[PDB]
């Protein structure tokens, strides 16, 4: 609006390996839009309001308002900030994280990032936390001024779960958060900047190569994007995704279990997106086969974790799976 | 019940517990 121009150009973009078609952009009035929703297919709805509050955020405004509690701020020399549990770390000693999670005050967090700026360091910062009470005033009133009866009316439309988590996300230019899935569904919700994302529906299970559950990066990929080994990862060459990018304003569905490949823009600036995390519906009382994608991925996991468990060591779910495989299913 | 122990979901997120 105003003329002010392309938002941003495709030479933002990384270049990857695979395929895309877009995601769809539609009015929350649109009936298709909540179609999308219903069967739980990704949708990019532009005037939600959701999030109308905090389009003034920035990082003065933020430092400002937003209190003196502690702030999860992942650091990385490279900017590939893959997720990792640290509390499945002892399961597997010979995995080195690549990115550090330091706890500090959001003043610390614009000082940090302001010497690298000035120093033109390589080093990169992804903030990941999740809003709380501690919180300044303003913030709150700011976070009470979202469209909760947009989403609430969503939450009950679709059976789901109670609103676990919103987590604030502010990164550096070219920040990327590999490809995962998530047990939850999601309203991803930007504010500041742009952000490409990537999805990927449950049914490409078979060529994303998720990480073994115990493994800490649980529900990330094993697949470079940058660099794909199809040797390893040979169906990674039948990957074809679901792309968008969403700016201010935008809110971007990601329904439980898609995949889901984030970046900001390079060369756009800091980035702002705060998420909805909502808990699924429960299983339903009659189960209708054949079984969904999502489904099957829900089976796959337990068996996993109830092997790791009966045979008392994680080290041992390959080895038996494999026993029961080779020369038997294969 | 072994079929919807099976499908059970979990809620597992890219975000760090304490
Ligand atoms: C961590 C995040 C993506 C990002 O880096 O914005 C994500 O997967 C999510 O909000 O569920
Ligand atoms: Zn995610």
């Given at each position: 609006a105003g003329a002010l121009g392309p938002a941003w150009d495709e030479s933002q973009l990384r270049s990857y390996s695979f395929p895309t078609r877009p995601i769809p952009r539609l009015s929350q009035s649109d009936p298709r839009a909540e179609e999308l929703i219903e069967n739980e297919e990704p949708v990019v709805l532009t005037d939600?309001?959701?999030?109308?509050?905090?389009?003034?955020?920035?990082?003065?405004?933020?430092?400002?308002?937003?209190?003196?509690?502690?702030?999860?701020?992942?650091?990385?020399?490279t900017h590939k900030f893959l997720y990792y549990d640290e509390?499945?770390?002892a399961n597997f000693q010979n995995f080195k994280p690549r990115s550090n999670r330091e706890e500090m005050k959001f003043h610390e967090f614009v000082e940090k990032l302001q010497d690298?700026?000035?120093?033109?360091?390589?080093e990169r910062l992804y903030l990941q936390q999740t809003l709380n009470d501690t919180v300044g005033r303003k913030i709150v009133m700011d976070f009470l001024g979202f469209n909760w009866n947009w989403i609430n009316k969503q939450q009950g439309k679709r059976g789901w779960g109670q609103l676990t988590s919103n987590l604030l996300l502010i990164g550096?230019?070219?920040?990327?958060?590999?490809?995962?899935?998530?047990?939850?569904?999601?309203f991803f919700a930007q504010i500041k900047g742009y952000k490409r994302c990537i999805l990927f529906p449950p049914d490409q299970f078979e060529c994303l190569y998720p990480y073994?559950?115990?493994?800490?990066?649980?529900?990330?990929?094993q697949v470079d994007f940058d660099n794909p080994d199809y040797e390893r990862f040979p169906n990674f060459?039948?990957?074809?995704?679901?792309?968008?990018?969403?700016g201010p304003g935008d809110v971007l569905y990601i329904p439980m279990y898609w995949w889901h490949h984030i970046e900001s823009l390079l060369?756009?600036?800091?980035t702002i997106t705060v998420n909805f995390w909502y808990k699924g519906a429960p299983t339903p009382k009659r189960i209708e086969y054949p079984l969904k994608a999502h489904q099957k991925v829900a089976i796959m996991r337990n068996i996993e974790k109830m092997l790791g468990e009966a045979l008392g060591n994680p080290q041992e779910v390959g080895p038996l799976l494999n026993t029961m495989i080779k020369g038997r299913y294969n | 019940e072994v079929v919807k122990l099976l499908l059970e979901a979990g809620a597992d997120v890219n975000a760090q517990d304490k």
């Open positions: 939600t309001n959701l999030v109308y509050p905090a389009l003034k955020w920035d990082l003065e405004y933020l430092q400002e308002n937003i209190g003196n509690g502690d702030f999860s701020v992942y650091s990385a020399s509390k499945k770390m690298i700026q000035q120093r033109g360091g390589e550096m230019e070219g920040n990327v958060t590999p490809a995962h899935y998530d047990e939850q569904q999601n073994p559950v115990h493994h800490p990066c649980d529900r990330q990929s060459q039948n990957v074809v995704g679901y792309e968008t990018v969403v060369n756009g600036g800091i | -």
